[PDB]
Amino acid sequence: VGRLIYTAGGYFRQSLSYLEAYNPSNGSWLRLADLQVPRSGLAGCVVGGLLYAVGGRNNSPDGNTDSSALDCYNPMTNQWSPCASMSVPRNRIGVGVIDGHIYAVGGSHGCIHHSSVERYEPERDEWHLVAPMLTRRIGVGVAVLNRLLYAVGGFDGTNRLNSAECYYPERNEWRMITPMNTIRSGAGVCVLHNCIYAAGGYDGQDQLNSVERYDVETETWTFVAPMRHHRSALGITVHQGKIYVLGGYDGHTFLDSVECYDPDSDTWSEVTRMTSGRSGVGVAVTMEPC
Numbered sequence: 001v002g003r004l005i006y007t008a009g010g011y012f013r014q015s016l017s018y019l020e021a022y023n024p025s026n027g028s029w030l031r032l033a034d035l036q037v038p039r040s041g042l043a044g045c046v047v048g049g050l051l052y053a054v055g056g057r058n059n060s061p062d063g064n065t066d067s068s069a070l071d072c073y074n075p076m077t078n079q080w081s082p083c084a085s086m087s088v089p090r091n092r093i094g095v096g097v098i099d100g101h102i103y104a105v106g107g108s109h110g111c112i113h114h115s116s117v118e119r120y121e122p123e124r125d126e127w128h129l130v131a132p133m134l135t136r137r138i139g140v141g142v143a144v145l146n147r148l149l150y151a152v153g154g155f156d157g158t159n160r161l162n163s164a165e166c167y168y169p170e171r172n173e174w175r176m177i178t179p180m181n182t183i184r185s186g187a188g189v190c191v192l193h194n195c196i197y198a199a200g201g202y203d204g205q206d207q208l209n210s211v212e213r214y215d216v217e218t219e220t221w222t223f224v225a226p227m228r229h230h231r232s233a234l235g236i237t238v239h240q241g242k243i244y245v246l247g248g249y250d251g252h253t254f255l256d257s258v259e260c261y262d263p264d265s266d267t268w269s270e271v272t273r274m275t276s277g278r279s280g281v282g283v284a285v286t287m288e289p290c
């Protein structure tokens with residue numbers, strides 16, 4: 001569905017269990033049922049009115065467990081319940097939905113930077129591996145447009161990436177696309193109109209406020225207006241033809257700042273701030289609870 005912006009887990013001193021929902025209609029937040037396990041560098045998505053939290057890591061004071069977890073949140077009940085886990089733990093995961101099916105992309109397992117990719121069947125509650133990406137990517141940005149899944153940037157273990165690639169499901173194939181103008185890991189990646197947006201991230205030197213978009217038709221990346229705050233490991237989603245960026249690290253602060261991009265006016269504005277500063281959250285949109 002679509003009515004609230006849910007932000008699940010994230011990081012500040014350690015991984016966090018928070019689920020809170022923003023209402024752009026009235027500027028209001030709700031605190032909702034905590035994740036059963038705290039998680040940073042996870043991804044959110046939504047299928048048939050249920051919110052999913054996928055992978056990440058528990059950076060606790062008593063150890064650092066990378067997650068293979070798929071946890072399901074029903075806003076009708078305000079409860080989390082476990083779903084089938086993935087083949088492997090994926091911290092700094094990218095996630096995308098094609099026709100009711102969830103794709104989990106790359107991310108890290110301790111030292112290991114994954115190229116692997118796997119697909120969840122909600123009704124059957126089963127995961128199956130698909131074709132690996134051409135490139136190992138963690139902190140990868142992942143978005144779906146026209147039933148094609150795009151994997152943008154991240155970190156291959158040695159180099160941060162400007163590269164990007166496209167999964168064609170009918171062929172179970174990955175092809176390279178035009179690289180970005182800017183090297184980005186931990187970028188906020190989403191879809192709006194006929195473009196894949198890569199917002200912020202890290203180029204190896206500094207946190208970025210630049211936003212560029214890929215036209216799937218023309219195959220070019222153009223910069224748009226930048227965000228006010230430089231950010232990496234930011235949350236990103238789309239509601240009512242607008243990009244929302246939540247949180248991130250600017251090099252000095254875990255930002256509580258929420259920016260909104262208007263593609264009509266090519267401008268960003270501050271629309272609220274989160275109850276607390278935090279990085280590496282999952283974000284997605286569904287019906288309001290209860």
Ligand SMILES: O=C(O)/C=C/c1ccc(O)c(O)c1
Pocket residue numbers: 209226227228229
């Ligand atoms: O207007 C903005 O928001 C973007 C521009 C910008 C902001 C900060 C910098 O350090 C910089 O080189 C460029």
Ligand SMILES: [Ca+2]
Pocket residue numbers: 111112113136156157
């Ligand atoms: Ca490796």
